[PDB]
Nucleic acid binder design. Structure first.
Ligand SMILES: [Mg+2]
Ligand SMILES: [Mg+2]
Ligand SMILES: [Mg+2]
Ligand SMILES: [Mg+2]
Ligand SMILES: [Mg+2]
Ligand SMILES: [Mg+2]
Ligand SMILES: [Mg+2]
Ligand SMILES: [Mg+2]
Ligand SMILES: [Mg+2]
Ligand SMILES: [Mg+2]
Ligand SMILES: [Mg+2]
Ligand SMILES: [Mg+2]
Ligand SMILES: [Mg+2]
Ligand SMILES: [Mg+2]
Ligand SMILES: [Mg+2]
Ligand SMILES: [Mg+2]
Ligand SMILES: [Mg+2]
Ligand SMILES: [Mg+2]
Ligand SMILES: [Mg+2]
Ligand SMILES: [Mg+2]
Ligand SMILES: [Mg+2]
Ligand SMILES: [Mg+2]
Ligand SMILES: [Mg+2]
Ligand SMILES: [Mg+2]
Ligand SMILES: [Mg+2]
Lengths: 123, 114, 363, 120
RNA sequence: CACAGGUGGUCAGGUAGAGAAUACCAAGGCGCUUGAGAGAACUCGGGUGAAGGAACUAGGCAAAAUGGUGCCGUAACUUCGGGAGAAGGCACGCUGAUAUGUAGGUGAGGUCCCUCGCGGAUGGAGCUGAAAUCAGUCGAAGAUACCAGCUGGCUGCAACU
RNA sequence: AAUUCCUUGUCGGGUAAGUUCCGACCUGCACGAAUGGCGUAAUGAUGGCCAGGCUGUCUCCACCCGAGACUCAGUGAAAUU
RNA sequence: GAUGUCGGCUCAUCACAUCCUGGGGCUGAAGUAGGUCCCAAGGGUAUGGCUGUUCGCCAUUUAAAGUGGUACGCGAGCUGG
RNA sequence: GGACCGGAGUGGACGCAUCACUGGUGUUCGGGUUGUCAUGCCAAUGGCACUGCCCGGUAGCUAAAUGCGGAAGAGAUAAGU
């Protein structure tokens, strides 16, 4: 349940530490992004020497939320903290080369095979 | 109600082990990767149990790869293949939500030998 | 002092043969002082073709490549972390070095027996890492116990160490491999002194058959693992490496051209170890000698001066830096100099890969 | 909405309601019949009758619960030494509401609530 | 107006507390001169709130928050006082031991003197009594309630009160 | 600029985005030296701006507790017309 | 002998000179994407930074961010910049 | 670079319902706890301190929860053919 102004920890090694959601993409008046949803972000905190820079505007895919995901059986998977993986604006592809922390099955689709393959643990 | 009792009972899993909040449990869940079912183990502390017959649930909390992860399992869902208690913890409280604030040393709980 | 990648695994993984093919191709101690080669310390020549190129261009009387040491760590038993002697020998063996190469078998052989009966590298890696993580959790518990008393004394450094350790402890209690954690450079610095076995950069040497360099479900499993923790791989054959180290240049080229290999796989292995430890190579070029030396990426000019002589480090004045490609294009030190492609670098400089310089000191 | 909810607010905050019904339960126990308002009597059923049920078994713990609920040791004594035995075989329904009309001062609907065996 | 306002002085119990604060009580005094129900919207006065966290708005208005003591620590700048409680960090309950109640306060007998008194020494019985350390112990939480600073940066104006 | 019309001046900072803010510039419509100029620590229920924390301020409201509103009994208005 | 103002909020409602979606003619319409005109009002038709602003610039969305009337709709509904 | 036509999925916004799930609430349930008063005292309890402060939480209500919807068709047409 990521919305505009929601700060996300970053789950890759792109060099961003804290990003902010500035748009929930994919719909007029769309309110929230869950996991597997692309958002537009501004990088609010970056490591000094990283592939991305503070104040950069780009995309991210939400991979962990505190709401979490429901599963078809009715079960839910909540995470501590909201995290996203940075993506290129045009290619939609991840910018880092490492994924840190678990991701979910909801992220498993043609578009995010890289994040699934790189993740330590897919839930 | 009696009708719904029957429908829910006809469906309730029969092998659910005894476990209490604070117990470290390992839950085997079925993962359907494409076509094939494997078992994925989720091992963590039971921080909450909902006792509702067929709608019984329990929350398991563990730190995966640096981040706390809670899975609320539906006890009788057939996706939960098995539950096994690995460590009986000693908490005197039904819901261990205070563990969400605990880190490391203060998040572990006394082993229950009772 | 050098750079080390200890060769580890379960029993019967193909490590002794790997270290043997290493030492057969390596250089004995009669060609490099300061290096008393132990039977578990095998120093081998580092492959830098830029060294051959510079030695062609300048034609020195002698040639010295940089040489890097392997430490073959053998002997592991289930329950190696419960205090037993051979497991503790394993621990003390691996702890001294800094880079770690795990050996995986990714081949099916009726005349070689596996570790659990079914040939599956996932099982191999999980058992080895559960061992290393039990040892590591032991270490981290001791450290966190040693620290929290100090951090309750209000010390800031102790609190930062405490935060890192308590964010690392649930990783180790779950048999997880602590390099998968997103630990910052400051945190890496904070806990470098605990010398954890589970963050040391680890490569994956994949002993595979001759006909299976591609399309290998065991190699595929190793690939997915090495991605899942950001590790690298060198799929090789121990038999092919023994053939490589046991022949002359003519027969080595013959066996390479028959099997389609262009350089020995040991070159690729030691190059994986080279890039594993943030290493890079510079050269000294001259008529007397051309020698390769190796520095960490990020290294200073003063430490590069020191890596030969201490006085060079301490009395440094200026270094005259020319790249390997700049040596290449203009045919020698004089040729690249006459273009002005020396650069004057002081005590704030960082030496890169390929640069050749002539140090100036006054002590 | 108040779908399925129980318990009359009776235009009091909760602790006033609890105090009032404690007092009213004590009044009913010691006098065995009291005039109050019909809604108040209907709610008083839900407090008194469990006290009598509790008093059907005379342990120290049960006298302690009764005392917590009544805060009157004379009421607890009469509950366990008289009322419990007087209702030992009666399966609930220890009170009787008898509507008795309308209070003059505010036209309030009034009832008598008594112990069922108040005749004997 | 039998009006939620205003009106000087005197008294000043207990437990906790620094306290005339505050909480709960005493003596004392009251339940405020319409009640009874119900448990819609809406309003007013509160409580809680998933995920988010100023996106609200003219404006963080309101709310939420901070909040005690001790110790450590404390920047720019300064008129050298300040700034400053800057900021920030740690500890905190209970029980036992030290010590059948300590440091300290009080000080009765008894002993000696005495310009025999409401004296001075000595002496410590009794009473009172922190603070600290160590060890143990309960809880999710020990300044547990009430009470009780939000903090920092840039800047206009006016020295200030 | 408590002063600047043009004007959201220009450039820079800060923000993803800054008519406000801060710094500089100076093309001062229309500053200027006791109807003082310029600085200035401290101070302020003073004006403006930024950040941390904090949050139902908001997304986007939900529930609950009480006082009314509602029903009954008693009493008994008002503006307006 | 009083018809309360701008903007915001809340709630709208109509028109159609249509922003999107629907149908079509022409095209300097290969396709994709457009331009233009005709039909068409069923439904839909941003969030933010700045500023009291509407507006506008800007950031980032959207199929689209339509244009007007309604006392420049709406203060016995709110606000009061 | 790249389609019409036709087909399948899956979303956004919106709407209706519902509470099985996931949750909020839950001053009517249980517990913990500080101060204090009281129940003769101990023990145990109760009152008050915002429900004293909190931790959970049943039913209900409920959204963020999860079901369903917009249609297809058929007449008569618009522009047009
Ligand atoms: Mg009433
Ligand atoms: Mg009166
Ligand atoms: Mg008065
Ligand atoms: Mg007072
Ligand atoms: Mg909330
Ligand atoms: Mg929350
Ligand atoms: Mg705003
Ligand atoms: Mg706004
Ligand atoms: Mg305020
Ligand atoms: Mg100004
Ligand atoms: Mg003044
Ligand atoms: Mg200025
Ligand atoms: Mg702002
Ligand atoms: Mg600007
Ligand atoms: Mg003037
Ligand atoms: Mg003059
Ligand atoms: Mg003058
Ligand atoms: Mg003043
Ligand atoms: Mg009325
Ligand atoms: Mg009436
Ligand atoms: Mg038209
Ligand atoms: Mg108007
Ligand atoms: Mg208005
Ligand atoms: Mg009006
Ligand atoms: Mg005004």
């Amino acid at each position: 349940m990521i919305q505009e102004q929601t700060m996300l920890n970053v789950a890759d090694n792109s060099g961003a530490r804290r990003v902010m959601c500035i748009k929930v993409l994919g719909g007029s008046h769309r309110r929230y992004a869950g996991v597997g949803d692309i958002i537009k972000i501004t990088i609010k905190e970056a490591i000094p020497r990283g592939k991305v820079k503070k104040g950069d505007v780009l995309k991210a895919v939400v991979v962990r939320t505190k709401k979490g995901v429901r599963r078809p059986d009715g079960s839910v998977i909540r995470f501590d903290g909201n995290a996203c993986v940075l993506l290129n604006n045009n290619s939609e592809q991840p910018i880092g080369t490492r994924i840190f922390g678990p991701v979910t099955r909801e992220l498993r689709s043609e578009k995010f095979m890289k994040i699934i393959s790189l993740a330590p643990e897919v839930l | 109600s009696n009708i719904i009792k029957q429908l829910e009972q006809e469906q309730m899993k029969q092998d659910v082990p005894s476990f209490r909040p604070g117990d470290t449990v390992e839950v085997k869940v079925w993962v359907v990767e494409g076509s094939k079912k494997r078992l994925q183990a989720f091992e963590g502390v039971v921080i909450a149990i909902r006792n509702r017959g067929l709608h019984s649930a329990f929350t398991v909390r563990k730190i995966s790869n640096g981040e706390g992860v809670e899975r609320v399992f539906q006890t009788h869902s057939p996706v939960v293949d098995s539950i096994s208690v690995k460590r009986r913890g000693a908490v005197r409280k039904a819901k261990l939500y205070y563990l969400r604030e605990r880190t490391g040393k203060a998040a572990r709980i006394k082993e229950r030998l009772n | 002092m050098g750079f080390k990648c200890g060769i580890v695994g379960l029993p019967n993984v193909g490590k002794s043969t790997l270290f043997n093919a290493l030492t057969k191709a390596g250089i004995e101690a009669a060609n490099f002082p300061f290096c008393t080669i132990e039977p578990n310390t095998g120093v081998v020549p580092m492959p830098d073709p830029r060294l051959d190129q510079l030695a062609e261009i300048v034609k020195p009387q002698r040639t010295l490549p940089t040489t890097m040491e392997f430490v073959d760590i053998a002997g592991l038993v289930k329950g190696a972390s419960k205090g037993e002697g051979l497991g503790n020998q394993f621990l003390t063996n691996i702890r001294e070095t800094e880079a770690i190469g795990h050996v995986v078998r990714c081949f099916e052989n009726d005349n070689i027996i596996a570790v659990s009966g079914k040939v599956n590298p996932a099982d191999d890696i999980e058992v080895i890492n559960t061992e290393l993580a039990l040892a590591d959790l032991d270490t981290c518990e001791r450290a966190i116990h040693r620290v929290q008393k100090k951090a309750k004394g209000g010390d800031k450094d102790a609190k930062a160490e405490l935060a890192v350790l308590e964010k690392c402890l649930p990783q180790l209690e779950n048999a997880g491999m602590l390099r998968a954690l997103d630990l910052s450079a400051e945190e890496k610095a904070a806990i470098r002194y605990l010398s954890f076995l589970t963050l040391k950069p680890t490569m994956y040497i994949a002993n595979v058959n001759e006909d299976g360099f591609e399309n290998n479900p065991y190699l595929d499993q190793v690939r997915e693992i090495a991605a899942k923790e950001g590790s690298v791989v060198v799929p090789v054959c121990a038999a092919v490496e023994a053939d490589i180290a046991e022949l002359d240049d003519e027969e080595r080229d013959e066996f390479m051209q028959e099997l389609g290999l262009e350089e020995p796989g040991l070159n690729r292995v030691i190059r994986a170890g080279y890039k594993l430890l943030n290493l890079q190579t510079y050269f000294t070029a001259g008529v007397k000698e051309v020698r390769a030396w190796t520095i960490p990426v990020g290294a200073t000019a003063p430490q590069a001066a020191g890596k030969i002589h201490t006085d060079f480090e301490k009395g440094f004045i200026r270094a005259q830096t020319i790249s390997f490609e700049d040596f290449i294009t203009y045919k020698g030190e004089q040729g690249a100099k006459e273009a002005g492609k020396m650069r004057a670098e002081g005590k704030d400089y960082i030496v890169k890969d390929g640069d050749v310089m002539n140090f100036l000191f006054n002590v | 909405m108040r779908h399925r909810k129980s318990g009359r607010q009776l235009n009091r905050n909760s602790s006033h309601r609890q105090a009032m019904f404690r007092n009213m339960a004590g009044s009913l126990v010691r006098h065995e019949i009291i005039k109050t308002t019909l809604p108040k009597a209907k709610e008083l059923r839900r407090v008194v009758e469990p006290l009598i049920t509790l008093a059907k078994t005379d342990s120290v713990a049960n006298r302690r619960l009764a005392f917590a609920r009544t805060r009157d040791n004379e009421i607890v004594a009469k509950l366990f030494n008289e009322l419990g035995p007087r209702f030992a075989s009666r399966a609930g329904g220890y009170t009787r509401i008898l509507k008795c009309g309308f209070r003059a001062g505010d036209n309030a609907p009034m009832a008598y609530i008594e112990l069922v065996d108040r005749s004997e």
